[PDB]
Design a protein around this nucleic acid. Structure first.
Ligand SMILES: [Cl-]
Ligand SMILES: [Cl-]
Ligand SMILES: [Cl-]
Ligand SMILES: [Cl-]
Ligand SMILES: [Mn+2]
Ligand SMILES: [Mn+2]
Ligand SMILES: [Mn+2]
Ligand SMILES: [Mn+2]
Ligand SMILES: [Mn+2]
Ligand SMILES: [Mn+2]
Ligand SMILES: [Mn+2]
Ligand SMILES: [Mn+2]
Ligand SMILES: [Mn+2]
Ligand SMILES: [Mn+2]
Ligand SMILES: [Mn+2]
Ligand SMILES: [Mn+2]
Ligand SMILES: [Mn+2]
Ligand SMILES: [Mn+2]
Ligand SMILES: [Rb+]
Ligand SMILES: [Rb+]
Ligand SMILES: [Rb+]
Ligand SMILES: [Rb+]
Ligand SMILES: [Rb+]
Lengths: 79, 99, 106, 99, 99, 87, 104, 99
DNA sequence: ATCAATATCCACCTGCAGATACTACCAAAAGTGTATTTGGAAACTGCTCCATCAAAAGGCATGTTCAGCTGGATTCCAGCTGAACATGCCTTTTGATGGAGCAGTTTCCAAATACACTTTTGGTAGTATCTGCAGGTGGATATTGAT
DNA sequence: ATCAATATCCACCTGCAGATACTACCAAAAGTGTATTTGGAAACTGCTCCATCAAAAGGCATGTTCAGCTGGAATCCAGCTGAACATGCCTTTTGATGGAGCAGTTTCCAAATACACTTTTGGTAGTATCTGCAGGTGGATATTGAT
């Protein structure tokens, strides 16, 4: 599993919060590919910040900074 | 006859239910697995603060939810009510994620 | 310390802190005296604006404590705050209830 | 007692003061205060970077209230800017005419 | 008898001609007056360096060209070849320019 | 001896042929009759926004003349970085 | 002896060092910072000029113009991404007609 | 000299040198050189800004070649990053090997 | 229209996570006082380039007619996706234990800054001469569309 | 597949705008050489919180069934929109002008940095008490969907 651990029902819940009524069977795999690309992009950058700071632990701040520079500023984790 | 709701009746009910709540919609552990797996390709032997993983889930889900909104707009533009891969593909191209 | 610069300026937000943060920030070689005052005032005001609308949202929802959901409803229902925060994600905020008309029954 | 004390400052206590002036009987959760803290930090950075560029563009070594003011005009949507400018000018007046 | 190209043939010839060249497509003077008129509504008695007007034109034309591409993609999604206001509106909505 | 006639309705100097041409560079083959007016409205907004910021730079610097650099800075801050005009 | 020849560089190490102090990026700038950054800038310049000169050659020209810069950048996936939010003045677009628009 | 105009420096002579290395018989128009000059300035500012932010995030008051290096890795795509990294490391090693 | 099966709502209740309130403690942060340095406003003005006018001419816009073919409407149905139900597999939780490693602290030197000269150089300026290619011509080949 | 109207290609040519070549000058830039200062790497480690178990408990995911209703194919036609033509206007181009306003330079002081010395305060930590509201209950009533 892993990526396949992100389930049809979970993807459907997400779709529903985004206002989606009806879903093509091919959507679940499209969606997983997209989520993978999103995480690759954000994680690459976060890990690059971890490495700079000489740490073995990815912190919330590593993630937060990575998100900000991807134009995806997240509030709530700057402690 | 036993009782059945028409197709689309329950879908609408979940839209109303999920747009009212804020809880995360992907299971916590499988997401954690996926995250660690991707990170392992960039650097081995990594640990994560637990708030690091949650920042990543908050951001990922907010991204997919807003993407689903744009996708839905592209379906409707084509006079459908069913989202397809081509609707996702159009939304991402226009966002500049594929362009 | 006689009078704090915040009390002098009429403010709850810390003028002295804003000043030190401007300098440590590598924004310019120098920083005038009114700049941290002006900026602290600006920051205080925008905070008041958000807490005001978010508080109202707590009221509407039958609550006296502001949670992130309320900060989200406040920001997304205000045209201008939504624009300022247009590339920002409020964690545990969810979304505004919104269904496209063509998806409604009949 | 000064060791693991490494100061973690935030705007949380100043946010809370302002809360009471606008909603004296409303409280705020930790998570929501954290959101508000991010908000003040983010808007501080935006305004300050804009002022920075302004002064660099105009070959000046000093950020003044004038740079803060133009930054705000460039950054905040119409009406939000008008009131922020109004609040900013007021605090610099009050501050000058003070002891 | 007289020669007629079928509808769409000259359209396609014009696409190739314009995708091959880099010259600006809006007439200069009229663009210049539009700029002066919009600016004057913001502030009286402004003058313009002529390269400031050209910078606005180059930017405005690359913005409009790239928007037509997205618009076109939106028409085609709907199984049309004709761009309509609703394609522009869809493109701008997904771009984050609208909503 | 001093001029400046009233500037009005200059949006209409963005002609149907000029708009067709831009649509062609953008790969468009066929164009609805309502596209012209929609495009004028979208240019107006784009220009308003860039000019507003360009003029804010001008005023801050205490000049009466909008420079290429004012425009370049306005474009950058809006995420439409322009190369070729300085800076 | 220049810091540039000492680094094996065509780009100006001293100018870069000075621009770094001037731009208020940190309180201190280390001696290796401008060396590494001139190197990177020269390399990216080389990369674009390589590709743009080829575009000039393909179009039977010996002088690089902005058209050639745009063709070089837009035809290269990495430069295209690096400059994804940048307009090259006088550059136009890549010839590209959507399939469904062609006749048959 | 007319009340000597203050000097306007550019990367032109350096872009020109690099050009003769790669395409010895190719010229560049002044408009093309102006794009190249904007390109070097732009990428300078982006790498310096990332470096600046990096230093700050880590409470470092010095931008070293290590900050430039990470900023290069954050900013540039795959293969450009790898090659840039290698060129800048080479130049630093060389530069410190003298004396 | 009836009426049943569900969902959904409001009123109330109560445990508890998480908020609140009090007290102690202390570095670092903020104010205040004194001595010095300087950024950049004022004043004056040299010199660029912006606004404006002139006049000539032809590229290109406007407005029209005509009909090809597109979009938009209608109808149809095959099949994909929603609903519902039956399992059972794995996420959750939680309580608890090593132990990685982030984070505080003290050291200390390689490298940064300050500074004082001295040399080198890129930018500007003036004046003068090549050269790549736009855009014009004229004629040959290719594309399109009517039969 | 043939024929003709027309676009398109390419070779060729020649003006000339812009690119290039020298000389000359210098203010700022850059290098060199010391003296003086310190940022942060190094090494040691204490305690926070991260990974890993254990272990029910059951929630929620997966597989299957069945059919409603959606998507997409096929068909038609009105009329929008492209192509072409005639006409002539207003953009473009070339050239000249005063003069606004930008930008160089020098003067000079209100306000900044730079240090020191004293006082304050926000953040951390410990202990203790308080409370908004999630979540569970019951019972009313609204919704949905079959007749
Ligand atoms: Cl699809
Ligand atoms: Cl000030
Ligand atoms: Cl429309
Ligand atoms: Cl260094
Ligand atoms: Mn007006
Ligand atoms: Mn001075
Ligand atoms: Mn006419
Ligand atoms: Mn007809
Ligand atoms: Mn059709
Ligand atoms: Mn059927
Ligand atoms: Mn250890
Ligand atoms: Mn020289
Ligand atoms: Mn030619
Ligand atoms: Mn130290
Ligand atoms: Mn249908
Ligand atoms: Mn004057
Ligand atoms: Mn206190
Ligand atoms: Mn409840
Ligand atoms: Rb604004
Ligand atoms: Rb990168
Ligand atoms: Rb109800
Ligand atoms: Rb041909
Ligand atoms: Rb830990």
């Amino acid at each position: 599993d892993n990526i396949q651990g992100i389930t049809k029902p979970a993807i459907r819940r997400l779709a529903r919060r985004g206002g989606v009524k009806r879903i093509s069977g091919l959507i679940y795999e499209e969606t997983r590919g997209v989520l993978k690309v999103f995480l690759e992009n954000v994680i690459r950058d976060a890990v690059t910040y971890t490495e700079h700071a000489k740490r073995k632990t990815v912190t919330a701040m590593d993630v937060v900074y990575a998100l900000k520079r991807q134009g995806r500023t997240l509030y709530g984790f700057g402690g | 006859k036993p009782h059945r709701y028409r197709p689309g009746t329950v879908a609408l009910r979940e839209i109303r239910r999920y747009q009212k709540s804020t809880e995360l919609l992907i299971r916590k552990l499988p997401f954690q697995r996926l995250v660690r797996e991707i990170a392992q390709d960039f650097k081995t032997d990594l640990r994560f603060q637990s708030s690091a993983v949650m920042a990543l889930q908050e951001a990922s889900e907010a991204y997919l939810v807003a993407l689903f909104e744009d996708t839905n707009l592209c379906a409707i533009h084509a006079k459908r009510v069913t989202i397809m891969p081509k609707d996702i593909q159009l939304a991402r191209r226009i966002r500049g994620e594929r362009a | 310390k006689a009078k704090t610069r915040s009390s002098r300026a009429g403010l709850q937000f810390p003028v002295g802190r804003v000043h030190r943060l401007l300098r440590k920030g590598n924004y310019a070689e120098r920083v005038g005296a009114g700049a941290p005052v002006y900026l602290a005032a600006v920051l205080e005001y925008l905070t008041a604006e958000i807490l005001e609308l978010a508080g109202n949202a707590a009221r509407d929802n039958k609550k006296t404590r502001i949670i992130p959901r309320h900060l989200q409803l406040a920001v997304r229902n205000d045209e201008e705050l939504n624009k300022l925060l247009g590339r920002v994600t409020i964690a545990q905020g969810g979304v505004l209830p919104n269904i496209q008309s063509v998806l409604l029954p009949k | 007692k000064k060791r693991r004390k490494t100061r973690k400052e935030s705007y949380a206590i100043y946010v809370y003061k302002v809360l009471k002036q606008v909603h004296p009987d409303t409280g705020i959760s930790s998570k929501a205060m954290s959101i508000m803290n991010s908000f003040v930090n983010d808007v501080f950075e935006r305004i300050a970077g804009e002022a920075s560029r302004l002064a660099h563009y105009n070959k000046r070594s000093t950020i003044t209230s004038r740079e803060i003011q133009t930054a705000v005009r460039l950054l905040l949507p119409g009406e939000l800017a008008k009131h922020a400018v109004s609040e900013g000018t007021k605090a610099v007046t009050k501050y000058t005419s003070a002891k």
